[PDB]
From a paper:
The SuhB monomers are folded as an alternating stack of three pairs of α helices (helix pairs I–III) and two β sheets.
To begin elucidating the structural basis underlying the transcriptional functions of SuhB, we determined a crystal structure of a SuhB-NusAAR2 complex at 1.65 Å resolution. In the SuhB-NusAAR2 crystal, two symmetry-related copies of NusAAR2 were bound laterally at equivalent surfaces of the two SuhB subunits of the dimer, i.e. below one exposed edge of sheet I and along the exposed lateral face of helix pair II, sheet II and helix pair III of SuhB. However, one of the NusAAR2 copies associated with one SuhB subunit via a flat surface formed by its C-terminal α3–310-α4 portion (interaction mode 1), while the other AR2 domain bound the second SuhB subunit via an edge formed by its α1, α3 and α4 elements (interaction mode 2). Thus, only interaction mode 1 can explain the mutually exclusive binding of SuhB and αCTD to NusAAR2 we observed. The analyses were again consistent with interaction mode 1 representing the relevant complex, as SuhB mutations affecting interaction mode 1 led to a reduction of more than three orders of magnitude in the affinity to AR2 (Kd = 141 μM for SuhBKL251/254AA-AR2), while a SuhB mutation affecting interaction mode 2 only had a mild effect (∼4.5-fold reduction in affinity; Kd = 435 nM for SuhBK108A-AR2).
Numbering used by the authors:
A (entry chain B): -3 to 266
B (entry chain C): 428 to 492
C (entry chain A): 1 to 32, 39 to 265
The structure:
């Protein structure tokens, strides 16, 4: 088949591959990795900052007019306010420090607040997940179509524990135990961007997590949607854009998850 | 390389075995709890079945009170 | 250099090649199936062993105990650990091969064919990943630790006990990992990629190789009460001695209520 590429997706892939190379080289020789603690069980390295600089440099050589948003730099405002690049330079920093090789670079581009193109890149497996709004999602050029589960029976649900917000621990454990009455099993990998890519690829059947930040899920949301799935908050509404309480999967899995979870929700999660 | 009193006083450990353990660096009851059965192999007179019973008893005392 | 290790590696890599070729074929969702990949991998492993050691006993999940005339040596095999991951094309699974002589495990292999990561160990000689020596995690207690685990999907009568154990450990450790391969979870404890591991009701081929990797990298392996009966019960706790002690202490009250 004939291959093509959207110009902003081309630059997003270029930036993610260059940052990913730098990350993988520092994995193999971690003699110069220097870690620092942000908050509770939350770390940032010198590798994170070098990857971020590479991504910003790549974007700005081609689109100096565009706004860029990251966790460590905040909002670097540009003259064209309609476009925003939303970046996570290294998702999975605890895995990286421990040399567990599951981590990724995440880049989303939004026009007027709506996601248009997305990249999630695993530099250890060389797995490039891409999506363009209205044109589908891909892994290494192959089109993604999600899971075909019709309810929770037999399903595998990806998730993250609230390790940075343990005031939610009791409620979260109750939600997991209640879901386990109907689903088969869970996966907990330590990269939310790759967990959402795996929902899009059908490697798991759904995902749920409390309190993610915007760059954690901006790219993975478009992967899920272009592969036939939906994203909602824990009551089925649209407020995940503000709270980061995320549920994702095909429409029948998400409907069944929400029906199971409804009576275990705390006020804060409502 | 001598044993501590909590090891010498453990039931089934004779003075000979106590000193054989201490020779391998297993000098206290808490050190014995940390061993695997493989760590105690080739001790004259000590079966694998007794090695396991001694390590279990050390853990019951030191780890589980 | 152990000759048996050489053969175990050879069998693991041949089976891994076959698994990776079937991973490239259309999955159940895409197809919208007659070749048992576990069974074809099992056949490659048994053929490789028997061509070098025709007298030895072989034990696997697909075939049970294939008795040899030399009952002093047993090969304990999981031809594909991580079947659900393979079926959904989640690329985390492994071949596991252990050799036991007169009741003691002497050689271990865990091979990840998608990452080309070969974990090996021999008794009294240490454990390695692709040639590099493994030394486990340095954690001195559970503060900040990452614990690998599996859910009792084959034994859901234990669901409430298990969820209670996870919830109490979470008040002491930082987080958990649930990967879908117990053999690789144990290999990751040996490499320090996670700080420890616990799971209910595993079978001997699931952990026979991984548990020697842990112990040759400085760790201990016990049953859920702290004893040595895990090969019989399949309830496994593994990590360095400080991490294991802290896990067992945390879990104990819930186990008493269950029994
Ligand atoms: Mg990050
Ligand atoms: Mg298997």
């Amino acid at each position: 088949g004939a291959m093509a590429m959207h110009p902003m997706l081309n630059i997003a892939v270029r930036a993610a591959r260059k940052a990913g190379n730098l990350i993988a080289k520092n994995y193999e020789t971690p003699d110069a990795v220097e870690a620092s603690q942000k908050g509770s069980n939350d770390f940032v390295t010198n590798v994170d900052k070098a990857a971020e600089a590479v991504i910003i440099d790549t974007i700005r050589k081609s689109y100096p007019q565009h706004t860029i948003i990251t966790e460590e730099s905040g909002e670097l405002e540009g003259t064209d306010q309609d476009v925003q690049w939303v970046i996570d330079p290294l998702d999975g920093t605890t895995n990286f420090i421990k040399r567990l090789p599951h981590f990724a670079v995440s880049i989303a581009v939004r026009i007027k607040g709506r996601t248009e193109v997305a990249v999630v890149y695993d530099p250890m497996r060389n797995e490039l997940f891409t999506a363009t709004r209205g044109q589908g999602a891909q892994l290494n050029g192959y089109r993604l179509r999600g899971s075909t589960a019709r309810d929770l029976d037999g399903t595998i649900l990806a998730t993250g524990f609230p390790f940075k917000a343990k005031q939610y621990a009791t409620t979260y454990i109750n939600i997991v135990g209640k879901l386990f009455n109907e689903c088969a099993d869970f996966r907990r990998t330590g990269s939310a961007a790759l967990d959402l890519a795996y929902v899009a690829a059908g490697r798991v059947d759904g995902f749920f997590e409390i309190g993610l930040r915007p760059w954690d899920f901006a790219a993975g949301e478009l992967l899920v949607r272009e592969a036939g799935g939906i994203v909602s908050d824990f009551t089925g509404g649209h407020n995940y854009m503000l709270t980061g309480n995320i549920v994702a999967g095909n429409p029948r899995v998400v409907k069944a998850m929400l029906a199971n979870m409804r009576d275990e929700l705390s006020d804060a999660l409502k | 390389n001598k044993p501590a009193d909590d090891l010498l006083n453990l039931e089934g450990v004779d003075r000979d075995l106590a000193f054989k353990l201490a020779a391998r660096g297993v000098c206290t009851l808490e050190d014995l709890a940390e061993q695997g059965i493989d760590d105690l192999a080739d001790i004259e007179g000590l079966t694998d079945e007794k090695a396991g019973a001694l390590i279990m008893a050390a853990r019951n005392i030191c780890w589980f009170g």
